[PDB]
Amino acid sequence: APAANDSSQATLNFSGRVTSSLCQVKTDDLVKNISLGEVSKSALEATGKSPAQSFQVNLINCDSLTDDISYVLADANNNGTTTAYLVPKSGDTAATGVGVFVETSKGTPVNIGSDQKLDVVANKGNALSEQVIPLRAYIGTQTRAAGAIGTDVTAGTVDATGVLTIRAADAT
Amino acid sequence: APAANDSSQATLNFSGRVTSSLCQVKTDDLVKNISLGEVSKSALEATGKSPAQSFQVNLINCDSLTDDISYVLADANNNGTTTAYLVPKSGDTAATGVGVFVETSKGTPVNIGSDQKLDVVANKGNALSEQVIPLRAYIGTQTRAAGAIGTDVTAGTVDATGVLTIRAADAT
Amino acid sequence: APAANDSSQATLNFSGRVTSSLCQVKTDDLVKNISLGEVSKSALEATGKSPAQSFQVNLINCDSLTDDISYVLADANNNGTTTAYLVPKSGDTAATGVGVFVETSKGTPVNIGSDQKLDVVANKGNALSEQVIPLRAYIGTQTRAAGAIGTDVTAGTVDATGVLTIRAADAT
Amino acid sequence: APAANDSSQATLNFSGRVTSSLCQVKTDDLVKNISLGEVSKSALEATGKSPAQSFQVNLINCDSLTDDISYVLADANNNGTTTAYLVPKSGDTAATGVGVFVETSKGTPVNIGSDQKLDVVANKGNALSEQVIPLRAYIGTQTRAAGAIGTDVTAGTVDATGVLTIRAADAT
Amino acid sequence: APAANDSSQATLNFSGRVTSSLCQVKTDDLVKNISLGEVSKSALEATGKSPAQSFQVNLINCDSLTDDISYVLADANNNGTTTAYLVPKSGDTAATGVGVFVETSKGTPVNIGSDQKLDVVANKGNALSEQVIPLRAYIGTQTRAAGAIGTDVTAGTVDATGVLTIRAADAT
Amino acid sequence: APAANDSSQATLNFSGRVTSSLCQVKTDDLVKNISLGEVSKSALEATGKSPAQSFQVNLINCDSLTDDISYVLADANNNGTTTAYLVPKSGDTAATGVGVFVETSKGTPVNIGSDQKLDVVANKGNALSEQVIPLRAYIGTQTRAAGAIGTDVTAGTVDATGVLTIRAADAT
Amino acid sequence: APAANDSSQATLNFSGRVTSSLCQVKTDDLVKNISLGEVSKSALEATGKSPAQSFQVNLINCDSLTDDISYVLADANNNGTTTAYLVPKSGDTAATGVGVFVETSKGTPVNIGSDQKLDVVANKGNALSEQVIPLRAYIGTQTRAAGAIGTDVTAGTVDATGVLTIRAADAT
């Protein structure tokens, strides 16, 4: 007779990548969930910004001979270098009139699609295995000035996603 | 020839809000994880409760003109005001006959869906930025009386979720 | 017109249990973080160990009639009784060939999965409320002998997870 | 019938490292919490600094043949040697225009990422087990001059994190 | 080949503030650990109090032109002016029906959230650098009268927290 | 606009208890720090002990009707009645094979966990307010005999913690 | 029902050491508190010093076969042997431009890090039980010359700490 369908299963979906870079991105940092604050009414009408939150992307197991490291912040919901911010995704509750700005830890803006340079940490000519890219981010009005709810800005959720492309190689 | 698929990426999912309130909820208080105790057998049969744990929800960057602040405790797994506790979620190991009761720091019950009042702290008429909502919660039997395991309660984990809605606004 | 999505929210995730034991575990001890030392090269090559650190797990609100308390040490990353240590987790920076050993405060090895006995401290036949389990732990080589970096051990981080199951019951 | 989920558990998370240095870092110095003062308004307008506080990093169980010890101060929220201070993290209540300057106990500035040398204490050619790194720290204005709250500084909290990498080796 | 993860490190978490006050609070008075007595049975039943202990909060480096100094005692586990005591925190062993009353060194009660005044010690018109706030505290029943363990009070621990906000300003 | 975070603050963490005993423990004796000597090489090889130091535990504000007083010595790093000494805590520098032996002021041994009797000092049928518990202690080898460093003992620090549970009652 | 938390507790934290030296350091001398003078304006501008104060260090229970005693003064807030003084610890009230100079009872400077020789006092070939190290100490300008407050020296408190390592051995 046909065999009975009484098996107990567990499905394991593995995933990964093969890359040409010399430095991994830490397995816990391949998908970040950076939680910015709330653009309350008072802050919105006063300065048009929320306080900036710091975060990092950690490289790990870098090659000893790594010489140059550079990264690019490319928006995953837009194309072109005309916008300074990251455009949030639309949806049922999406809030219109705001965007997510990213900056370097000292306040220098990070432009979309423009590559920055990272300085390798070396000890006696060998690069250390762990290296860190420090960054900032905050929600602000698209016009970079105070806004009033309903005139230009609207209340709701903000969900924006960016992608960092990292290129660690040996110069010569 | 087609370009090689050899890039190294990190995905940065930002999130936030835009609200009409005048006070932020502190960025690390947007998702609490309050760990209550264990309702051991002796405690369950003696008075049917666990000792209550204290916790706070901190507001920050409040507007100077904030005058009236209120909050509402709402359940994520139930609707209506007929129930006094927060209903635990169900699952493989969830326990039956148990609920989560929340209270103010002095022991006055915090009913679901009924708004409370928070007294604002001000210095010379201008509210201080940082303001706190103190609360307290314990796991107890639904009947609010002692009860052994088997007859009405069953061993397992207790996981419940509440949601506080906070409305800081200027009276006039 | 449809309502505006402009609420300010805080999420409160309560968690707990309902057990069959007579004794609680102190709410601060449901998740321990014991920070063992560093197995430097000198101590690695000398005896293959680090100095042993001490830690405790406190029971509280025990029942007056508690007659017997026993506990079992179980591993979160291995099965059976064929190993003496706790196998570290694996990751980008995990070190290989080292494990974590746990001992009673006097140096009696604590085996994995074998019941230990805890003497209840009493006052005139009624057990006190608070009772303590003292333990000790160190990082060592799996072979339990000196060993250099390269031949068997490699440098990295060490993370291990055990779980104590405590059974306070009244014999009769 | 299926077993009941009524076990009482305590979770033990052990952690540590394995290294290549010949000296341990004292188990309680692996994570410091230095509490610099408060940069009051008077001291801010006078010289833009707070009084320098002292702290230590203790090495223990050094090797008898330890010949050379060097330590490097790396900032955990910035890259490169473009800055003399440690850039504070950002947040809801962070203060702008401020940084944390570190120094040797005698007032010699400690630059970021540049190797220092530590003299080993010896008794007849054998290094003593314990050896101490003394340091200073103070909160100061980024421009290294007086500055009023409003024009360049703003009131708030200062949190900075630096990392000391200690390398003990035997020259020959 | 990838670099090896063999660094030995120490983490330094600096912290601090920036304020608009003219006076510092002494760096070791930013967090007091005041140890009140033990409310024995005899003392509890006689007058429902423990003998009151003294403590101080020292300001330092005040401004030569400091003129007006005020402080406010704010409770960290309650809001409003309804209560005279600091509400103890709740937990596994906390004691019910008890509070922590604060007073001036002479015995005048200190109410929560009500401005007090401090006289500034001056020498020829210029305020001295160091100035002191002497206080007193005791653990007494909530009803302010005798009470036995069982009927209203219960044995346990008493942890309570207040926060002093000091405002030293130049009136003119 | 949002209020500024420019407050200067002091935190006051009060602590205490509510007990069932009639006698307080003097608030300075709740946490003793008793310094024993140094077990030198000569005294270690001669008799394996250090000269015994004396200390006290003071009770104050005893009830007039106090009739019976008792106390017990309990170890904080060990269990049971097998061992006659207090097991030292483990750490980077802890010494092996030595313990702390406690004795009555005359030289009688005080065994762990077995209650002693304290005579109540009275004046005309009513107990005096203050009553003292005199004790003694020293560091000595666990074998209670001579022992050399290297063979069984090892040079290091010694930290041990006992706990005195005092039970003053009115028998009748 | 769960037992009540009503015990009365006293905590005894013992401490000590096991050493290899033949002589104990007298238990009252393990932590000296030497109180130097005040460097007033007159002495500061005359010679930049305060009068030397005499202190003492007692050794007790020496072995009868002791033959060679040597002691080294090590600073606990500095490293190396370039400085002749002990660098004061920094803080809110510390004074700049000042240092502590230590000397032998006859005026011979005691350089930090270099061994000194103590002569054993014997009676018929056997060392006495008690032996003494006499010393001096004074606060002086770091330039070892007259200084003026407000130019190279600032008024304030001076706190410094040294550590004598004492090594008593039997030559043959």
Side-chain angles (χ1 to χ4, degrees):
Chain A
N5 301 288
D6 61 2
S7 180
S8 173
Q9 302 294 323
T11 305
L12 312 180
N13 297 319
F14 302 107
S15 57
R17 288 211 285 271
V18 182
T19 76
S20 69
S21 177
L22 294 174
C23 290
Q24 293 187 25
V25 176
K26 187 176 293 227
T27 302
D28 313 279
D29 276 329
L30 286 167
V31 183
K32 301 296 299 297
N33 282 281
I34 300 102
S35 178
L36 315 180
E38 312 190 316
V39 183
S40 70
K41 192 167 147 306
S42 62
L44 181 50
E45 311 215 350
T47 307
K49 290 198 280 263
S50 77
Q53 315 286 133
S54 278
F55 64 90
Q56 314 160 33
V57 180
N58 285 276
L59 285 56
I60 191 67
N61 279 120
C62 278
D63 193 35
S64 310
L65 274 60
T66 300
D67 188 358
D68 183 38
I69 306 181
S70 64
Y71 63 91
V72 192
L73 179 74
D75 198 349
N77 192 3
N78 191 36
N79 67 66
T81 52
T82 300
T83 44
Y85 50 97
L86 289 88
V87 192
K89 285 150 193 262
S90 304
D92 311 78
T93 59
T96 186
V98 286
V100 170
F101 300 79
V102 182
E103 301 165 298
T104 303
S105 61
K106 304 191 48 49
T108 308
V110 167
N111 292 335
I112 317 304
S114 303
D115 59 352
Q116 277 73 41
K117 173 174 173 279
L118 191 77
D119 297 83
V120 296
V121 177
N123 166 74
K124 293 182 183 293
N126 300 313
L128 305 191
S129 81
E130 191 145 40
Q131 308 208 22
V132 174
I133 296 150
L135 292 163
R136 270 160 55 131
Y138 66 90
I139 303 167
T141 309
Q142 291 179 359
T143 61
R144 315 203 81 164
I149 282 193
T151 64
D152 47 346
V153 203
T154 294
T157 298
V158 177
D159 294 358
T161 180
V163 176
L164 272 170
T165 298
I166 295 152
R167 300 181 175 96
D170 181 24
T172 286
Chain B
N5 296 292
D6 63 28
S7 301
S8 173
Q9 315 272 341
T11 306
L12 308 169
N13 294 319
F14 305 99
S15 62
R17 305 195 201 227
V18 186
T19 69
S20 195
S21 179
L22 289 174
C23 288
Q24 289 188 23
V25 180
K26 199 199 287 280
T27 296
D28 63 358
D29 291 331
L30 293 168
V31 186
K32 297 296 299 295
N33 280 279
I34 298 105
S35 170
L36 310 176
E38 320 188 319
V39 179
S40 68
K41 177 177 170 64
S42 83
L44 185 49
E45 285 168 14
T47 182
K49 286 139 68 172
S50 80
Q53 318 289 317
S54 280
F55 63 90
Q56 324 163 40
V57 185
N58 292 58
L59 286 57
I60 199 69
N61 286 306
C62 280
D63 192 58
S64 309
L65 272 43
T66 308
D67 172 324
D68 191 326
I69 298 184
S70 304
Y71 66 93
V72 191
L73 181 72
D75 195 348
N77 189 19
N78 185 311
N79 67 67
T81 55
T82 315
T83 311
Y85 50 99
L86 282 72
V87 190
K89 289 174 288 189
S90 307
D92 291 355
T93 60
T96 75
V98 176
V100 175
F101 302 82
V102 182
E103 313 183 312
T104 62
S105 59
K106 297 192 57 42
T108 308
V110 175
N111 289 322
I112 308 302
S114 66
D115 69 82
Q116 275 77 49
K117 187 213 196 71
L118 187 85
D119 283 358
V120 303
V121 174
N123 165 74
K124 312 223 182 83
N126 302 315
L128 300 188
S129 83
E130 203 265 320
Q131 310 206 21
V132 186
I133 294 151
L135 297 162
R136 187 177 71 190
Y138 62 93
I139 303 172
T141 302
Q142 290 175 357
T143 62
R144 308 189 92 156
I149 286 171
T151 84
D152 63 0
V153 174
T154 300
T157 57
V158 172
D159 304 336
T161 304
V163 185
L164 275 168
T165 294
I166 293 153
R167 318 180 203 248
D170 193 348
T172 288
Chain C
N5 303 293
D6 62 28
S7 296
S8 170
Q9 312 261 324
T11 298
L12 308 173
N13 293 319
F14 309 99
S15 63
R17 313 189 201 224
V18 181
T19 63
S20 194
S21 179
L22 289 172
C23 288
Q24 289 189 23
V25 181
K26 177 149 78 45
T27 295
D28 202 354
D29 283 28
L30 288 167
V31 182
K32 298 298 300 296
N33 276 279
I34 300 106
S35 51
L36 311 178
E38 320 189 340
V39 181
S40 71
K41 179 183 166 303
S42 302
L44 181 49
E45 262 155 19
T47 68
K49 296 198 288 292
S50 76
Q53 316 285 320
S54 279
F55 63 93
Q56 287 189 331
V57 185
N58 292 59
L59 290 60
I60 191 62
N61 291 314
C62 280
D63 191 89
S64 307
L65 314 170
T66 306
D67 273 308
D68 197 56
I69 301 183
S70 66
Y71 65 92
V72 178
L73 178 71
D75 192 352
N77 200 47
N78 193 4
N79 267 36
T81 58
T82 317
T83 45
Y85 46 90
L86 293 91
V87 192
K89 295 270 162 32
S90 311
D92 312 278
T93 57
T96 79
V98 307
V100 173
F101 300 80
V102 181
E103 310 178 312
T104 295
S105 61
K106 298 193 292 280
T108 309
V110 179
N111 289 320
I112 308 300
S114 69
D115 273 30
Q116 269 76 42
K117 180 190 209 265
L118 192 78
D119 286 356
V120 302
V121 183
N123 188 359
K124 310 213 212 151
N126 300 316
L128 297 190
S129 84
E130 181 176 90
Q131 314 205 23
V132 177
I133 293 154
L135 291 155
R136 188 176 69 189
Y138 64 93
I139 297 173
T141 309
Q142 288 184 356
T143 64
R144 315 196 80 167
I149 284 169
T151 80
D152 54 345
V153 175
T154 70
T157 317
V158 174
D159 301 359
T161 312
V163 183
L164 276 163
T165 293
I166 297 169
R167 297 181 175 94
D170 181 10
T172 291
Chain D
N5 303 296
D6 66 3
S7 81
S8 172
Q9 311 259 318
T11 304
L12 309 180
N13 302 323
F14 306 106
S15 59
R17 311 184 204 218
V18 184
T19 69
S20 195
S21 181
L22 291 171
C23 293
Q24 292 188 22
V25 177
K26 190 174 287 194
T27 296
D28 54 69
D29 291 331
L30 298 171
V31 179
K32 303 296 295 291
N33 278 281
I34 299 101
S35 53
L36 311 178
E38 315 191 317
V39 183
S40 72
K41 180 173 168 60
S42 284
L44 178 50
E45 299 206 78
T47 56
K49 296 155 53 183
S50 81
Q53 317 289 323
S54 276
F55 60 96
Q56 274 144 40
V57 181
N58 289 58
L59 289 55
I60 191 67
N61 288 314
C62 280
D63 204 29
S64 314
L65 301 93
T66 306
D67 216 334
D68 204 59
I69 304 183
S70 299
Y71 65 87
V72 176
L73 177 71
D75 190 345
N77 199 9
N78 196 34
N79 67 59
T81 57
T82 304
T83 43
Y85 48 94
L86 278 55
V87 191
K89 280 127 64 168
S90 308
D92 311 296
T93 58
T96 61
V98 175
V100 172
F101 296 80
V102 177
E103 311 176 313
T104 293
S105 62
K106 302 193 294 282
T108 308
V110 170
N111 297 322
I112 298 284
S114 86
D115 288 86
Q116 268 78 0
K117 173 172 172 278
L118 179 63
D119 304 78
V120 301
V121 177
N123 164 78
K124 314 283 211 53
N126 301 316
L128 301 195
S129 80
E130 196 202 40
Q131 314 202 22
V132 178
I133 287 150
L135 288 159
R136 268 156 56 133
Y138 65 99
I139 299 171
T141 311
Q142 286 178 352
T143 54
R144 315 198 80 165
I149 289 169
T151 79
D152 55 339
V153 176
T154 66
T157 298
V158 175
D159 283 28
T161 300
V163 176
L164 275 168
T165 288
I166 298 152
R167 295 182 172 96
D170 183 8
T172 288
Chain E
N5 303 299
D6 61 0
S7 298
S8 172
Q9 288 178 346
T11 308
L12 311 171
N13 297 316
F14 309 106
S15 60
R17 314 184 203 224
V18 185
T19 77
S20 197
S21 182
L22 291 171
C23 293
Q24 290 187 20
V25 180
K26 206 162 57 48
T27 300
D28 63 358
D29 291 331
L30 297 170
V31 178
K32 303 291 294 295
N33 286 283
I34 299 102
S35 165
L36 312 179
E38 315 184 319
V39 181
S40 69
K41 190 165 78 175
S42 66
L44 180 53
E45 285 185 18
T47 177
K49 292 154 52 181
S50 79
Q53 320 285 135
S54 278
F55 61 93
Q56 283 133 27
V57 185
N58 291 60
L59 285 53
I60 191 68
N61 286 311
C62 279
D63 206 26
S64 309
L65 311 95
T66 306
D67 184 52
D68 180 78
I69 301 185
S70 300
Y71 63 88
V72 178
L73 178 75
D75 192 350
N77 195 27
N78 197 317
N79 67 63
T81 60
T82 304
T83 46
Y85 50 91
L86 300 174
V87 190
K89 288 178 286 187
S90 306
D92 291 331
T93 64
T96 70
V98 175
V100 173
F101 302 80
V102 185
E103 308 175 310
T104 75
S105 66
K106 301 191 56 42
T108 309
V110 166
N111 295 318
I112 304 299
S114 299
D115 285 326
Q116 267 70 43
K117 201 151 74 55
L118 182 87
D119 189 358
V120 302
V121 189
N123 167 75
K124 292 195 313 278
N126 302 319
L128 301 189
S129 79
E130 177 163 29
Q131 314 210 24
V132 181
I133 292 149
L135 291 161
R136 192 174 74 188
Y138 58 92
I139 300 170
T141 312
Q142 287 177 355
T143 62
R144 313 199 83 163
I149 289 170
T151 61
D152 40 337
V153 176
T154 62
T157 302
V158 176
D159 312 300
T161 299
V163 175
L164 276 170
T165 298
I166 296 153
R167 298 177 173 95
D170 183 9
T172 289
Chain F
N5 309 299
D6 60 38
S7 299
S8 171
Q9 301 207 129
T11 305
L12 312 172
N13 299 317
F14 305 98
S15 62
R17 313 186 204 227
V18 183
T19 70
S20 198
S21 175
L22 298 175
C23 292
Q24 294 187 23
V25 179
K26 193 177 289 191
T27 294
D28 299 319
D29 283 28
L30 291 165
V31 180
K32 300 297 298 295
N33 286 281
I34 298 103
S35 181
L36 313 177
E38 319 184 319
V39 181
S40 71
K41 181 178 171 64
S42 87
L44 182 52
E45 305 200 318
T47 180
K49 287 189 305 220
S50 73
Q53 317 283 136
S54 277
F55 66 89
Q56 293 180 350
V57 182
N58 297 72
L59 288 53
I60 190 64
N61 288 312
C62 282
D63 189 23
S64 305
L65 311 172
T66 305
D67 203 68
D68 186 74
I69 302 181
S70 299
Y71 64 89
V72 176
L73 184 72
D75 195 352
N77 198 31
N78 185 18
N79 272 137
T81 61
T82 318
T83 48
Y85 54 99
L86 282 70
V87 193
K89 286 258 164 205
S90 308
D92 292 331
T93 55
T96 42
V98 307
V100 173
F101 301 79
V102 177
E103 312 166 80
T104 301
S105 64
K106 313 192 54 49
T108 304
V110 166
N111 292 320
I112 306 308
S114 65
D115 60 344
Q116 269 76 29
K117 184 189 210 54
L118 185 68
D119 271 22
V120 177
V121 176
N123 170 76
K124 312 263 191 73
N126 306 318
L128 299 190
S129 79
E130 180 155 90
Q131 312 198 26
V132 65
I133 300 151
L135 291 157
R136 195 173 77 187
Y138 65 88
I139 301 168
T141 308
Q142 294 180 354
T143 56
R144 264 163 141 171
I149 287 172
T151 62
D152 33 356
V153 174
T154 64
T157 299
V158 171
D159 302 338
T161 305
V163 178
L164 272 163
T165 300
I166 292 152
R167 299 177 175 94
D170 191 7
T172 290
Chain G
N5 306 292
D6 64 5
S7 51
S8 172
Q9 300 283 321
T11 304
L12 309 176
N13 303 320
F14 305 108
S15 64
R17 311 183 202 222
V18 181
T19 70
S20 72
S21 179
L22 294 170
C23 297
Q24 300 182 24
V25 174
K26 197 175 189 295
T27 296
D28 312 289
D29 276 8
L30 291 166
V31 187
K32 299 294 293 291
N33 286 58
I34 302 103
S35 179
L36 313 180
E38 316 189 317
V39 184
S40 69
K41 184 184 287 293
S42 298
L44 189 57
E45 306 184 320
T47 61
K49 285 184 292 222
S50 76
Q53 314 284 322
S54 281
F55 67 85
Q56 183 178 178
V57 187
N58 282 293
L59 287 54
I60 192 67
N61 294 318
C62 280
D63 192 28
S64 304
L65 311 163
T66 300
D67 269 309
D68 186 74
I69 301 184
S70 301
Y71 63 94
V72 193
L73 176 70
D75 194 15
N77 193 1
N78 188 34
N79 70 31
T81 58
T82 299
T83 56
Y85 50 96
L86 289 90
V87 177
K89 273 191 149 271
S90 312
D92 304 307
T93 57
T96 68
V98 171
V100 175
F101 299 74
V102 180
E103 297 180 353
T104 294
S105 61
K106 312 175 59 40
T108 314
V110 169
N111 296 319
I112 65 155
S114 65
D115 307 89
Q116 263 72 38
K117 189 171 183 178
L118 189 81
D119 273 29
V120 171
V121 175
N123 167 78
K124 307 205 207 315
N126 302 319
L128 298 184
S129 78
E130 181 147 280
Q131 308 200 25
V132 181
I133 304 156
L135 292 161
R136 270 155 58 140
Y138 64 89
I139 302 169
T141 310
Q142 287 178 353
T143 56
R144 294 179 67 188
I149 298 191
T151 71
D152 66 342
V153 182
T154 41
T157 291
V158 175
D159 282 28
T161 187
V163 186
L164 294 174
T165 295
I166 292 152
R167 299 179 172 94
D170 183 359
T172 289

